[PDB]
Amino acid sequence: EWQENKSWNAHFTEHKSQGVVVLWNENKQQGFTNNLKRANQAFLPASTFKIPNSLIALDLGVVKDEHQVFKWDGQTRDIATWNRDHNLITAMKYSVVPVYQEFARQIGEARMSKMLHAFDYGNEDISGNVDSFWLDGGIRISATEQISFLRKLYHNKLHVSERSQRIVKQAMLTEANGDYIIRAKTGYSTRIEPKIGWWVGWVELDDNVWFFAMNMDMPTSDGLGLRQAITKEVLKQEKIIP
Numbered sequence: 001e002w003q004e005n006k007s008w009n010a011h012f013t014e015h016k017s018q019g020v021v022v023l024w025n026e027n028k029q030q031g032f033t034n035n036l037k038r039a040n041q042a043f044l045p046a047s048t049f050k051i052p053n054s055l056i057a058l059d060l061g062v063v064k065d066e067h068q069v070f071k072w073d074g075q076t077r078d079i080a081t082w083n084r085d086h087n088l089i090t091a092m093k094y095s096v097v098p099v100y101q102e103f104a105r106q107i108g109e110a111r112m113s114k115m116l117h118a119f120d121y122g123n124e125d126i127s128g129n130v131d132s133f134w135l136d137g138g139i140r141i142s143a144t145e146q147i148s149f150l151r152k153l154y155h156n157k158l159h160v161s162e163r164s165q166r167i168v169k170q171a172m173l174t175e176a177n178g179d180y181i182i183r184a185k186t187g188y189s190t191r192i193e194p195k196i197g198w199w200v201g202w203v204e205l206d207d208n209v210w211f212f213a214m215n216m217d218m219p220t221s222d223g224l225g226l227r228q229a230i231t232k233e234v235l236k237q238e239k240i241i242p
């Protein structure tokens with residue numbers, strides 16, 4: 001069911017890094033990784049939490065739809081794309097933390113906790129501040145646990161409405177061409193050691209879906225582009241994409 005290929009470590013070590021890639025073949029129900037231990041080690045989800053956070057906000061009516069505008073609060077932040085109005089689509093695309101912090105405040109501790117347990121999401125622990133627990137609180141999730149959660153979402157099996165799941169999968173759209181579609185979300189965790197980057201999602205092909213979840217050491221922001229680049233190079237090596 002699970003195969004470990006330590007030779008794939010070269011994708012990380014050739015960049016003076018270390019990490020894990022996890023792939024799941026939905027048709028064959030088989031998994032692949034370079035490191036079974038790290039595949040099951042739990043990290044802060046950071047901005048990959050925008051997937052469950054969006055689902056909860058939509059299902060509770062905190063967010064009406066993907067067109068509702070979340071007005072910039074007029075506080076100048078150091079990420080230029082955050083200093084503007086957003087909807088769910090662009091908020092996901094630009095990982096706009098302050099918009100999702102307000103989502104969490106309106107969701108509230110009790111409903112957030114209950115929904116994460118319903119999702120079987122990571123350690124389901126929201127200890128910390130309700131508006132930042134996914135950045136510096138107690139919640140943790142592994143690469144394999146991300147795959148499990150994403151598979152439920154793909155099949156509309158999460159305990160929210162079909163509509164909420166369709167909207168979030170629309171907002172996850174990252175790349176599409178004549179050969180494949182990628183729906184995914186990046187993450188960048190810096191507040192608690194070790195600093196890492198995430199990329200989790202899936203690749204849609206004509207007759208199969210390949211789920212993926214990766215994290216990697218990220219001592220500085222200079223390496224953030226390696227999250228997607230390394231993953232796609234693994235996918236290309238395994239003949240999942242051209």
Ligand SMILES: O=C(O)c1cccc(-c2ccccc2O)c1
Nearest residue numbers: 079094095096186187188221224
């Ligand atoms: O991963 C991104 O594409 C992304 C999106 C938004 C912000 C940042 C970021 C980069 C450096 C330091 C802090 C950040 O919050 C990174």
Ligand SMILES: [Cl-]
Nearest residue numbers: 169170171173
């Ligand atoms: Cl779509």
